Structure 1
Amino acid sequence: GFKGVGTYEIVPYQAPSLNLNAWEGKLEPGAVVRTYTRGDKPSDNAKWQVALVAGSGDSAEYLIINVHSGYFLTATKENHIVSTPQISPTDPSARWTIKPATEVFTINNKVSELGQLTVKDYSTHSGADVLSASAKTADNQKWYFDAK
């Protein structure tokens, strides 16, 4: 469960055998983010520091920081893949709200036009693009937070 700031695996609701992964786990900025096989213990490129940057409780905004690279999960365009570019912590496209979907959460960009984290094509297999796409109350837009 999401209990505020901390380190987490972020796991797609339709495919809990997978997690959110910065592709190839390199220190170069700009990796795209996809679902990937979890393993028994997650790799640091598949662990994320949720870091509070504004507000609290209902008004909390967070950076979602890759543990390996230190880069921030960012939406660039609606219905396009998310990535971890080098970006200012004050850029709203790198800021997210984490809200109960109805346990299970949506991850919503501070720029409302950019939407929420969404697994492309409702995939349940490793290597699926994770998009920022407009909210549709769909199961591929729901996520678990597993504290690590």
Structure 2
Amino acid sequence: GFKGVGTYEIVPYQAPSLNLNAWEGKLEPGAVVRTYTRGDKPSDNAKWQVALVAGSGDSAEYLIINVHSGYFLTATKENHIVSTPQISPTDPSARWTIKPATTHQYEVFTINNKVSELGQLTVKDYSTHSGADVLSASAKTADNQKWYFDAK
């Protein structure tokens, strides 16, 4: 479950054998983000430090920081793949609110950009297989916009 700041796998609701993965797991900035197979031991490029930067409660604003690279999960354009560029911690495109979206008692959450037009973290075309683009897309709390936070 999501219990605030900590290190997590971020796991798509429709495909819980997958997690949120900084593609290629390199140290250079600007990686795109996709779903990928979790594996028995998740790799550091697929772990994320949720770090509080403003507020408290459901309105709290967080950076979602890649464990391997230290770069921040960022939305760059509506209905477009998200990435981990080098970017200021005060840039709202790199800040996210995490909101309960419990579904049949599954403790899942939406991940909502501080720039409201950039919307929610979204698995492209509702894919249930490894390697799907993760988008910032218009917020609807569809099933492909829901996520588990598995504490690590």
User: TM-score scaled to structure 2, two decimals?
Assistant: 0.96
What's the offset of the Cα at 1:136? 1.7
For the residue of structure 2 that corresponds to 1:140, the secondary structure is helix
Give ranges in structure 1 of 5+ residues lacking alignment: none
1:8-67 superposed Cα distances (whole Å, 9 cap, x missing partner):
000000000100000000000000000000001110000000000000113200000000
Aligned to 2:8: 8
1:69-125 superposed Cα distances (whole Å, 9 cap, x missing partner):
000000000100000000000000000000001x11000000000000000000000
TM superposition outliers: structure 1 runs of 4+ over 4 Å: none
What's the offset of the Cα at 1:135? 1.1
Structural RMSD (CA): 0.5
Moved more, 132-141 or 19-28: 132-141
Identity between Structure 1 and Structure 2 (%): 100
User: TM-score scaled to structure 1, two decimals?
Assistant: 0.98
- Contact residue 124 and residue 135 of structure 2 kept, 8 A: yes
For the residue of structure 1 that corresponds to 2:4, the secondary structure is coil
Give the Cα–Cα distance (whole angstroms) in 1 for the partners of residues 15 and 6 of structure 2.
22
Count the aligned residue pairs: 147
Give ranges in structure 2 of 5+ residues lacking alignment: 102-106
